[PDB]
Amino acid sequence: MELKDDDFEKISELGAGNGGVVFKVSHKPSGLVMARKLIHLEIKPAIRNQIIRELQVLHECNSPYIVGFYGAFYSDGEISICMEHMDGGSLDQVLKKAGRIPEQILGKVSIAVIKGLTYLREKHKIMHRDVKPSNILVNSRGEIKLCDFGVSGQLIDSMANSFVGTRSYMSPERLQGTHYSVQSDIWSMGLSLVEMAVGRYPIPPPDAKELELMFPPMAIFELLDYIVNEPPPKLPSGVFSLEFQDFVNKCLIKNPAERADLKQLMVHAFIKRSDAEEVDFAGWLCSTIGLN
Numbered sequence: 395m396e397l398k399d400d401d402f403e404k405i406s407e408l409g410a411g412n413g414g415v416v417f418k419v420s421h422k423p424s425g426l427v428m429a430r431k432l433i434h435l436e437i438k439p440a441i442r443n444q445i446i447r448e449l450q451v452l453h454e455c456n457s458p459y460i461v462g463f464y465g466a467f468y469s470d471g472e473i474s475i476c477m478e479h480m481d482g483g484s485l486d487q488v489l490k491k492a493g494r495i496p497e498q499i500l501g502k503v504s505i506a507v508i509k510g511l512t513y514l515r516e517k518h519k520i521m522h523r524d525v526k527p528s529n530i531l532v533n534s535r536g537e538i539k540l541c542d543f544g545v546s547g548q549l550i551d552s553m554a555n556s557f558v559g560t561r562s563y564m565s566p567e568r569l570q571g572t573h574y575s576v577q578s579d580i581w582s583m584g585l586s587l588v589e590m591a592v593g594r595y596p597i598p599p600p601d602a603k604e605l606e607l608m609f610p611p612m613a614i615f616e617l618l619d620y621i622v623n624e625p626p627p628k629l630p631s632g633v634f635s636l637e638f639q640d641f642v643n644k645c646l647i648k649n650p651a652e653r654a655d656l657k658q659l660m661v662h663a664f665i666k667r668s669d670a671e672e673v674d675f676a677g678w679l680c681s682t683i684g685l686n
């Protein structure tokens with residue numbers, strides 16, 4: 395069925411962050427609850443047609459690790475992406491409630507991010523371009539899915555960009571120039587996992603007394619200079635398994651050719667161990683964020 399603006403009904407607002415605002419909506423003719431993201435763009439009619447045309451490949455992006463898509467359309471200065479409503483929200487939101495996400499749970503997430511990225515790469519020859527906790531979605535069925543990946547190049551271009559400034563998940567190479575590709579997503583995942591594991595954006599790293607308590611903010615140039623020139627972030631020892639520690643280290647190597655790739659991580663000790671693990675993520679999620 396084709397989706398049109400007048401067939402939806404707002405339920406609640408899910409967020410923004412930015413350019414694009416996302417609401418929880420009821421598609422009146424199906425009865426389905428969807429999450430509709432509207433992106434306001436001052437764009438010519440020919441290239442907004444290109445954006446919609448390119449977005450149609452989302453109908454072919456079906457994977458347990460990729461957020462479901464319903465349809466894409468243009469309304470009144472806004473392009474709409476109607477997708478599966480993830481009743482658990484983003485990992486950024488669950489981290490706010492959790493304070494800290496456990497290692498076992500982070501193993502289940504890591505498995506989903508690698509499998510999600512492998513899917514987009516193998517099946518669709520596309521890179522995520524923005525792997526961070528808010529673009530990693532969860533639900534009460536215990537599902538961990540990716541969204542906000544760069545399926546449309548023209549949309550990628552049209553939405554720009556640097557809306558940070560105390561948190562950048564950009565790899566040192568992407569921060570430094572045009573010399574980036576799929577390896578950038580590895581870094582972003584690596585950084586995201588350290589954040590969720592420790593309970594805060596890991597730059598600047600925490601001191602002796604800061605880590606003791608757990609277990610003013612930074613200027614844009616200070617943070618970016620840290621990323622590109624200072625040694626990469628690490629997981630604190632003792633509190634985390636050597637397997638997780640090595641895994642994040644492999645992800646956060648500043649040299650993208652030295653950095654581990656999806657292939658290597660997929661067979662990493664940490665992943666192999668998490669795959670064996672019997673983890674009720676669904677039950678953990680609902681009890682920590684307040685659902686079931």
Ligand SMILES: Nc1ncnc2c1ncn2[C@@H]1O[C@H](COP(=O)(O)OP(=O)(O)NP(=O)(O)O)[C@@H](O)[C@H]1O
Binds near residue numbers: 411412414415487541
């Ligand atoms: N399909 C969905 N189901 C449930 N919640 C969603 C869905 N999509 C987006 N959201 C929520 O909407 C919030 C804001 O959406 P979004 O415009 O993507 O901002 P952001 O992820 O914080 N930054 P960015 O994705 O880089 O533009 C996110 O934190 C999610 O919690």
Ligand SMILES: O=C(c1ccc(F)c(F)c1Nc1ccc(I)cc1F)N1CC(O)([C@@H]2CCCCN2)C1
Binds near residue numbers: 449541547553554
């Ligand atoms: O929402 C998006 C987005 C950007 C490009 C693109 F091609 C899309 F399809 C996008 N949305 C999207 C993709 C797959 C599903 I399933 C649902 C979706 F809503 N962007 C990427 C974003 O995270 C920002 C844009 C600005 C720079 C940093 N990343 C937000």
Ligand SMILES: [Mg+2]
Binds near residue numbers: 528529541542
């Ligand atoms: Mg997002």
